[PDB]
Design a protein around this ligand. Structure first.
Ligand SMILES: NCC[C@@H](Cl)C[C@H](N)C(=O)O
Ligand SMILES: N[C@@H](CCCC[NH3+])C(=O)O
Ligand SMILES: N[C@@H](CCCC[NH3+])C(=O)O
Ligand SMILES: N[C@@H](CCCC[NH3+])C(=O)O
Ligand SMILES: O=C(O)CCC(=O)C(=O)O
Ligand SMILES: [Cl-]
Ligand SMILES: [Cl-]
Ligand SMILES: [Cl-]
Ligand SMILES: [Cl-]
Ligand SMILES: [Fe+2]
Ligand SMILES: [Fe+2]
Ligand SMILES: [Fe+2]
Lengths: 253, 252, 252, 252
């Protein structure tokens, strides 16, 4: 505990990354809106992710809420999953502090090529999604903020779905999402994930979803959302379905 | 009717296409496994398309059979639709004679850049699919034969799904389809369709599906399947689900 | 003239663009590091284009300085062309005030999605390149600053080269440019240009060159360079060959 | 050295499966190009050393320099030294290997069609030897479907010589439209190293070699074969510059 986390994380990163290799990651982040931290590009120590995973498994058992809706601001794409709200996750001292770590944010800032600002709406700082059943999905969407760090805490086999599909270099018009038309005009990048992986996502300009589960499995992630200088902007849409299951943009079925 | 159809169709194409313009279409076919005949490049006269659509809506009314299964030889991807079998469609003199037309097959032979042989299995010569419910879909799959001309007879709005997604330059291993693995390695091309469109699909090397309907709509196609010189072989998989809903590879 | 330029350009752009259609251009700029303003998407009135072209054709005949060298900071890619220095172009009140026009910078900031800042080095605010001979080229390189609006004043036919090739989402390591290697890993996008076109380029993250002239033709551009907030840094490399032909990185 | 076919069969059998050849067949269709590097060897080192030693002898004897522009390919240059097919065919090693039913039988798993060694007696083989700056095999297609290129000696990538390719094209000798095709399509740059081999779909892939940025040494061997689509075809163009420097399409 204490400042030993940042001290060991800086060491963990200094053993693995250089400015030259981060710049290559920054190129891939700009090109794909997505950079994956796998066994080839570990981001945090095993002992640290295990601690975050055990914190999230306790939050799921205590505060999971089922969501089964369509979001009108993203072309009525579905949100079929369980969630844990940001206000409940922020109680975790481990998750809240590491999410504001200047060591972590300073490292990822070399990938984004701009400052990562931990000042987002109090209902969207953190998110856990927990999909368990067939057809569970985080439908096509964008984010209100620029940056999200996703912890692929548990992934089903790729044959069961659950991959992240992404279209970079897009934009979110809440009154006219044009999701299926964007797919017709653009190539979809499918990103397979494994348990233990993390990935950085440029959420405001990358249209993305999780491929629906073809079988009852378990797909669990943690979302750390941060702002860019561009997001310091007014929230609109009435579509905060995770914080409010009956938001104005949430539709039945 | 009759041979006046081949003569009229030959005139229809000579007004619109040249070998130079077909050659550019052939390039796109090899690159995408897919070429679309839309309002800017019609394939058949509107009178002829209306005659085929009226024929298919009749066969649907009389011989539709709901399918709701998963196909093991394509990674348990769903087949959630209603179909009309090839043997019932062949009874239509219009569709069967048009599917073996020396004018139509000869013209598309300049896009495929190889001979289009109408020597395919009697249960796969033709197929009509009729999706009408939310989540209805023709899951990811390949074709046993090389060529299929799909008539997009009725397409819902793009915002309701029903697009054709495709991954060209792949191959079908029925013992190990690797569908989701292929998607992770390849970019997906999504092709929107409108009612009246037609498209040619290289079905053996293009992994493809139809995007599931996001609500109750109607999506109706006619499939004309032909072979290349490479398909003149033996079928495998026990997965002919459209003809046999209880095929071995079909699951609930 | 003078203040009427902003009032005229504000009315010109207002009749040809919407926030929705500018957002689509921002996508293409993010995706390719490049967006072209051609006959489909004009940026300036024809009267304004002719005035700027006339100015440049004067500055050419008065300060054209031949450059034939290899720049070590970009893998010794050639620079075979004539140039006109920024300090010389700065004397033109038209080109200088246009580069700082709140209407011009304000509109393009919807494509870059970030503020465009006309605070760059005094030797790189403006540049005119004038390629005239076979094998003349502006070799593979990056820009020291983020943004550049290029005025394709006079382009040869595409059969004579002169197209802009680009690889977006890269970066400039002046100690290890890795140019040909990056080409082996990335798809090269070729952008053909016509006389009167303009294009906004993200020069810092887009590796780009002009295809060498296959024969003695005339290729003339005006380069307006601007900074993003990220550029407000130390110039490095001793490679300012356009202002100093005897630069350290320049192999004559 | 005898009947090589037993030795090559055991070599490939330990390094390939039908499932991994099919993945190469995917890449060959998608890119018109499949490279045999250290990751995927095609011939043993003892055979590569023999083929290389044979060619280096054919060079020192029958090297004619070509410095021309080919009209049927948009006047793209051909600055190199060559050795005609008739001179190369005198090598018992190259000719028997080029017709080996073990080599062809394996590569036909990548092409997915029969590879027929019935091609013109002046285009069976070709050795090109680029040694000076600007030396290049300019943008072009091939009259025949396939070519196995032996990258016997490749300079470092900083000196150029990489193969650039645009798959899913075709050769219109009356209207090549090379630079236009480049403006419409992405260029794939393939870096080669000494000892590499690659299979090229030469009729549908527009390809060239990047000019040597300086005096280096780029040596290749070309084994051109036909597909059934090339059988007994009528060669046209008057552009056989390799066999005939004064060909009708060859411009100085
Ligand atoms: N902005 C005008 C000068 C730029 Cl074009 C120089 C560039 N870095 C190069 O290497 O040619
Ligand atoms: N905007 C997203 C929710 C993200 C919540 C966490 N950043 C959606 O519509 O699904
Ligand atoms: N092979 C396809 C069926 C094609 C039937 C018409 N050619 C599938 O698995 O669904
Ligand atoms: N067609 C090629 C020559 C190939 C010779 C060997 N196959 C060219 O235009 O240069
Ligand atoms: O579950 C995932 O990987 C994606 C989540 C996402 O895009 C979001 O939280 O908005
Ligand atoms: Cl998001
Ligand atoms: Cl099919
Ligand atoms: Cl530049
Ligand atoms: Cl060739
Ligand atoms: Fe998201
Ligand atoms: Fe199909
Ligand atoms: Fe060639």
């Amino acid at each position: 505990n204490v400042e030993q986390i940042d001290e060991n994380l800086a060491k963990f990163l200094a053993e693995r990354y250089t400015p030259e290799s981060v710049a290559q990651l920054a190129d891939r982040f700009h090109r794909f809106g997505f950079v994956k931290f796998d066994a080839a590009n570990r981001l945090v120590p095993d002992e640290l992710q295990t601690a975050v995973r055990e914190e999230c498994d306790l939050l799921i058992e205590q505060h999971k809420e089922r969501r089964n809706l369509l979001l009108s601001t993203t072309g009525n794409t579905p949100r079929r999953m369980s969630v844990v709200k940001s206000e409940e996750i922020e109680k975790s001292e481990l998750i809240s502090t590491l999410s504001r770590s200047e060591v972590l944010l300073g490292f990822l800032a070399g990938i984004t090529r701009e400052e990562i600002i931990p000042e987002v709406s109090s209902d969207e700082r953190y998110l856990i999604t927990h999909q368990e059943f067939k057809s569970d999905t985080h439908g096509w969407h964008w984010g209100d903020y620029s940056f999200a760090l996703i912890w692929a805490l548990r992934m089903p086999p790729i044959e069961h779905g659950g991959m992240l599909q992404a279209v970079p270099h897009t934009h979110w018009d809440k009154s006219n999402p044009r999701i299926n038309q964007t797919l017709c005009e653009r190539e979809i990048n499918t990103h397979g994930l494994e348990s233990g992986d993390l990935y950085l996502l440029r959420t405001d300009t990358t249209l993305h979803r999780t491929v629906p589960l073809s079988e009852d499995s378990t797909r669990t992630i943690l979302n750390m959302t941060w702002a860019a200088k561009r997001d310091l902007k007014d929230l609109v849409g009435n579509d905060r379905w995770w914080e409010n299951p009956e938001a104005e943009a949430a539709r039945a079925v």
